[PDB]
Symmetry: C3
Subunit: 146 residues, 3 copies
């Protein structure tokens, strides 16, 4: 997946960004089984005041998570995963849950590429990972934090 | 909804951003019935020259609106809403309509969270809001303009 | 289409951004027949360190291309197009392919506006273009490299 995380500039320190990315990545690995290194978290910072709710200019405490996933998972599991992102980002970013918005979009795995390779169907990551070259396996394995 | 609005740095002042956000938000409530406070407008600014059309580097006068919606509305209504966003953003941002691009993407409401809660289906916002806790209703209600 | 290209600040020079935009645009036109001027490439730069893979902070060498397309093309063609984007962006940016991520999303053409006009079905860009006003055609036509 790619989790695009929209936040205000200076809301999250480097350590807070790491914790938020860990929270999201752990949630995705834990509920889907997808290897850690296949989850990207991409922080998009803008100056505070660029977010409007109901036309009302917001401060720096809003977070929007746009998660981009492969088609193929149940609505039940997507709901658990969105809820766990809400709960765990709330803790990691020290932000009240009413400030957190999370949308998931899905596409066929056949039109998604990570590390220059087309993704497999959900749940077939082991088989796919074993038919990768040694060098590609090694590169992906460096992108794992517990 | 979340409307991601991609503009060049400095093309919209704070006042023009408020006007553009108000235009989009009024359009969305007016045509869908969704309460004002459920519409987010999220400005993403980049330096002039980061947009290319046909390979041609652009100035600061381009706008791309990526609207993210719940599934469930008609093509007719989505067309009227995209057109009204073109018309009203043209006036609010003082930009010619030919500079405006608008794409709508839809997801099941069941995978869409706002204010920490899952959204209802597109016509059920009234009863959904009523059955939120009082502190949640109060917090959403602070976001009306 | 709109190709949203997420890169680190300063990783691409203006020249490299032009090259990357031309690589993507030329790929899209060559494989789909869609005119040059209908393809937008929109660079979104953020400071290095804002990208995490598996929880590991990255340097400035990651690129994520989010292409937004009309519904109607085959999985075969979308696959060829994504592969050609990986290949041609790798050359244009001098970035190894392992750093390149590419996702395509699709929406109905009826909820898709470019140059203030609703798009036609894929393959029908010819008729559609011919029925635009002459001023609208002239404006579009300037966006060819």
């Amino acid at each position: 997946p790619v989790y695009m995380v929209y936040v205000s500039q200076d809301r999250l320190t480097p350590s807070a960004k790491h914790a938020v990315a860990k929270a999201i990545t752990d949630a995705h690995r834990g509920l889907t089984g997808t290897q850690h290194f296949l989850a990207q978290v991409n922080f998009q910072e803008q100056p505070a005041g660029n977010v409007f709710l109901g036309g009302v200019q917001q401060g720096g405490d809003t977070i929007f998570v746009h998660g981009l996933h492969r088609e193929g998972r149940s609505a039940d599991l997507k709901g658990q995963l969105a809820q766990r992102i809400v709960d765990d980002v709330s803790v990691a970013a020290e932000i009240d849950r009413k400030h957190i918005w999370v949308y998931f979009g899905e596409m066929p795995a056949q039109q998604m590429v990570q590390y220059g390779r087309f993704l497999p169907q959900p749940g077939h990551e082991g088989e796919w990972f074993d038919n990768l070259s040694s060098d590609e396996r090694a590169f992906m394995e460096t992108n794992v934090d517990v």
